[PDB]
Write a protein that binds this ligand. Structure first.
Ligand SMILES: Cc1cn([C@H]2C=C[C@@H](COP(=O)(O)OP(=O)(O)OP(=O)(O)O)O2)c(=O)[nH]c1=O
Ligand SMILES: Cc1cn([C@H]2C=C[C@@H](COP(=O)(O)OP(=O)(O)OP(=O)(O)O)O2)c(=O)[nH]c1=O
Ligand SMILES: Cc1cn([C@H]2C=C[C@@H](COP(=O)(O)OP(=O)(O)OP(=O)(O)O)O2)c(=O)[nH]c1=O
Ligand SMILES: Cc1cn([C@H]2C=C[C@@H](COP(=O)(O)OP(=O)(O)OP(=O)(O)O)O2)c(=O)[nH]c1=O
Ligand SMILES: Cc1cn([C@H]2C=C[C@@H](COP(=O)(O)OP(=O)(O)OP(=O)(O)O)O2)c(=O)[nH]c1=O
Ligand SMILES: Cc1cn([C@H]2C=C[C@@H](COP(=O)(O)OP(=O)(O)OP(=O)(O)O)O2)c(=O)[nH]c1=O
Ligand SMILES: [Mg+2]
Ligand SMILES: [Mg+2]
Ligand SMILES: [Mg+2]
Ligand SMILES: [Mg+2]
Ligand SMILES: [Mg+2]
Ligand SMILES: [Mg+2]
Lengths: 150, 150, 150, 150, 150, 150
C-alpha cells in the first residue's frame, strides 16, 4: 500500500553538519510525503526506547548519549515501500561501505557518526513513529503527487 | 547580536511541491541555525493571527483558506541579521519579480502561491515565533559556529 | 563504436513532475550527445509499436494508455556503449529496487510511474529510434569530443 | 493570463557545452510548462527571420552564422508572465554583467556566446513561436497546476 | 582580452566549512580556466603583503591572524573580465548584504568570516598573483572550452 | 586510523571538462580532509613513475602521453579508510561499468578518459603522495571533526 510509513531521524551529527535540508530533499525528490516533522533534543528515555534492541550491545551507552547530545530532526515519511526504500537511500551501517548516491555513502566515514537513522522494518517503523510522535502530530490527509502512483 | 531569530514557513504549495528540503538547505548553507522546526496544518485562528496585519486586505480570505488547506513546515532560524537576510533569500512578494537565486525567484510564478513566508522585521519575527512555537520547542543551546562568526 | 545510439523517453509522469531537464542533464554530464529531441503526445499506434514486445502481457493495456496520457519527451543519445550505460543510469524496472544515484532510484516509487524508458539492446534502440524520429530529426554530424574519447 | 508563452533557444554554444538539461530544469523548477521542444540545426532563413530586428546591425552576420553553426534546442514555455520572467532568468545581453543566479550570469563570459536566447515581449514571442514551431508541435492542453496557480 | 587573470583565495573559514569544491565549481561553470591552484597555510609575511592596503585599518591585525590561522586554497582564474566577474560572483564585503546566488550571499553571515577573497582590480590581481604564485606554478598553455569565446 | 591518506588526481580530461570543483566537493562532503592540493602539468618522468606498475601494459604510452598533455589537479585526502572509500567514490576503471553516483559513473564513457585517478591501496597511496607532493605541501595539523568521528 502507498500508505506505508517509516521513521527517520537526522542525528545530532547530521544536524550539526547542516544536512537536514539535503536529506529531506532526497526523500521529497523520491516522491515520499512528509507526514511528521520536528526538531527536538531527545531525552535519555526516548533514545533508550528508540534503540531498545541494542540495550545489550556494548555500543548502546555511547549511542544513547550521542543521540541526546544535541538537536535531532525526527521525521515520518509515507509512500509505497518507504521503509525498505529509505534504508536503501541511507546506505548500510558503516558509511565507508555505503554506496555513493546513498546518504551515508555520500556524507559519512564513521559508524558512530552516521548521520541518519531509519526504521529497519514496518514493525519497527510503527513502534518508533508511535514513540517519537503524538498522533495529532502526524498528517491524516496525505497528498502524494498524482504522477507518482498508478 | 548573532542571536536574532526569524520565523519562516514553507506554505502548502511549497510543501506539496517537495521544496521543503531545498529551502531548509538554503538556510543551513547560509550559516543560520535551525532553532525550531515542525510540520502542521494551520488552524483558521493561527492563520488569521499570523496574517492579522492583512485582515482588511482583499486577498486575506483566500490567503487564510489556502494557508489552512494543507501542511505547512514552520521553522525558526537564528543568526546575525537573519530576519532581513531571510527576506533577501526569499525574494519579494511577487515571485515573478523575485531575482534568480532567491527562493520565490527560482520556484514561483503566482503571488498567492509564493512558496514560503518569512518575518519582515524583528518585531514581526518575535510575534510570529511566539504564535507558532512554544518555548519548549525552541533550542536554547546555540554555540555559535567559529567558522561563521568572528 | 563511439556512435552507438539509444532511444530514451521521459514518460508522462517524468514530464508532469518536471524532471525533463534533470534527466537530460544527467546524460549530457555523462558525455553522451543529444542527436534527437522532441516533445509529443504519443499516439496509440506509436505506443503499441514501441512496447510491441509486451503486447501479450497483462500490463500492456495500462502501459499504452499511460504513455499516451500526456506529453513525452523523446530523445536519442549517442556514444560508446550508450544503450547499456543509459539503462544502468536509469536503474531497474521497479524504481523502489533502483539504486540511489540512478534516475528511477532517485525519483520514483512505482513500476507503472517509473519516469523514463530506455532501449534495452542496440537492436531495440535502432528500431525504437526509427519509430520515434524521422532521419531529418537526427543529427548526422557528431565529431567526438576529444575530452570524452581517446 | 496564465497561458502566456515565450520562445527560448539553447544556442549552439549552450548545446555544445551540455547545458540543455540545466536550462530546461530551471524553467521546469520555476513552474513554467514545456509546450514545445525540439533540437534542430537552424537554416540561414530561420536565423535571419528570428533576428530580423537586427538585420541592419553590424553583429547580425556573425550572429546568424553562429546560430546556424550547430544544433539548437528550441523550446516554448507557458505560464503567467513567462516572457519577462524568462528574460530575468536569462540575465542581460552580456553574460559578464548578468547576475549570479541567472543563466548567463552562471555560465557565460561572452556576448557572442551567451548560451540562450529568449523572446523579449509577448509580441516577439508569438512571432518567434510561429517561426520555430508548427501548431501541431505545441501542446494545446495545459491544465494549470493548482500548486502553482491560485 | 580573454587572458585577464584574477587571484582568489578560499579563506580558512571557506576551507574549514568544506566549500572549496563548491567555489571552484562556480568559476568552472562560468567558463573560467584555473591557471594556478594550491593549498597552503599563509605566513604572516604573505598575509601582510596580500592585505597591505589595509595595514592602517583597525581590522588589519585580526585579518592577518585569521588568514594565517589555517589552510587556504589560493587560486588563479583566467578569462574575459574575470576580475570584475569573480567579484560579482563573490558578492559584497558584507555577506548579509550579498545577493542570493553570490558566494557570500549563499554561504556567509559575518564580514570577518566571508569565505573567499578576490582581486578588486587587474592591477591588484597582477600584484597578488605574483605574491602567492611562482611563475612556474601558473599555466602558460591555456585551453578555454571553444564554445565560450567568439 | 583516521589519519590514512590517499592520492587523487583530476586528469587532463577532468580538468578540461570543468569537473575539478565537483570532484573536490564530493570528497569534502564525505568528510575527508584536503591535506594537499596543486595544479600542474605532469612531466614524462612523473607520469611514468606514477604509472610505473603499468609500464609493460599496451596502454602505457598513450596514458603517459595523455596525462602529460595538460594540467592535472593533484590532491591528497585524509580520513578513516580514505583509500578504499575514494576508490568506491571514483567507480571502476571503465566508466561505462561504473555505477551512477560514482565520479566515473556520472561523468565518463572512455577508459582512456576516465576523469580521475586514485590510489588503489595504502602502499600505493604512500608512494603516490610522495611522488607528487613534497612534505612541506602537506598539512600536518588536522584536528578531526567531532561531527565526523566518534
Ligand atoms: C552496529 C553499530 C551501530 N552504531 C550506531 C550507528 C547507528 C546506531 C544503530 O545501529 P544499527 O541499528 O545496528 O544500525 P542502523 O540500523 O544502520 O542504524 P540506525 O538507522 O538504526 O541508527 O548505532 C555504533 O555506533 N556502533 C556499532 O557498532
Ligand atoms: C499582496 C498579496 C499577497 N498575497 C499572499 C502572499 C504573501 C501573503 C502575505 O502578504 P505580504 O505579507 O504582503 O507578503 P510577504 O511578506 O512577501 O509574504 P509572507 O512572507 O508574509 O507570506 O499573502 C496574496 O495572495 N495576494 C496579494 O495580493
Ligand atoms: C513489467 C511491467 C512494466 N510496466 C511498465 C514499466 C516499464 C514499461 C516497460 O516494461 P519493461 O520493458 O519490462 O521494463 P523496462 O525496460 O525497465 O521499461 P521501459 O524502459 O521499456 O519503459 O512498462 C508496468 O507498468 N508493469 C509491469 O508489470
Ligand atoms: C548586441 C549584440 C548581440 N549579440 C548576440 C547576443 C544575443 C543576440 C541577439 O541580440 P539582442 O537581441 O540585442 O540581445 P538579447 O535579447 O539579450 O539576445 P537573444 O536572447 O535575443 O539572443 O546577438 C552579439 O553577438 N553582439 C552584439 O553586439
Ligand atoms: C572591511 C572589512 C573587511 N574585513 C575582512 C573581510 C575581507 C577582508 C578584506 O576587506 P576588503 O578588502 O575591504 O573587502 P573585500 O574586497 O570584499 O575582501 P577580500 O576579497 O579582499 O578578502 O577583511 C573585516 O574583517 N572587517 C571589515 O570591516
Ligand atoms: C586498463 C586501462 C587503463 N587505462 C587508463 C585508465 C586508468 C589508468 C591506469 O589504469 P589502472 O590503474 O588499471 O586503472 P585505475 O586504477 O582504475 O585508474 P587510476 O586511478 O590508477 O588512473 O590507465 C587506459 O587508458 N587503458 C586501459 O586499457
Ligand atoms: Mg537500526
Ligand atoms: Mg508578510
Ligand atoms: Mg523495456
Ligand atoms: Mg533579443
Ligand atoms: Mg579586497
Ligand atoms: Mg590505478
Amino acid at each position: 500500500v502507498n500508505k506505508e510509513r517509516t521513521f527517520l531521524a537526522v542525528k545530532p551529527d547530521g544536524v550539526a553538519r547542516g544536512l537536514v535540508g539535503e536529506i529531506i530533499a532526497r526523500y521529497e525528490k523520491k516522491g515520499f510525503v512528509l507526514v511528521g516533522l520536528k526538531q527536538l533534543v531527545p531525552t535519555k528515555d526516548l533514545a533508550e526506547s528508540h534503540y531498545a534492541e541494542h540495550k545489550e550491545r556494548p555500543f548502546f551507552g555511547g549511542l544513547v548519549s550521542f543521540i541526546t547530545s544535541g538537536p535531532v530532526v525526527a521525521m515520518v515519511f509515507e509512500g509505497k515501500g518507504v521503509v525498505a526504500s529509505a534504508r536503501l537511500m541511507i546506505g548500510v551501517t558503516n558509511p565507508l561501505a555505503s554506496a555513493p548516491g546513498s546518504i551515508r555513502g555520500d556524507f559519512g566515514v564513521d559508524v558512530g557518526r552516521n548521520i541518519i537513522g531509519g526504521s529497519d522494518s514496518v514493525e519497527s517503523a510503527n513502534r518508533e513513529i508511535a514513540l517519537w510522535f503524538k498522533p495529532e502530530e502526524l498528517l491524516t490527509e496525505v497528498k502524494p503527487n498524482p504522477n507518482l502512483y498508478e
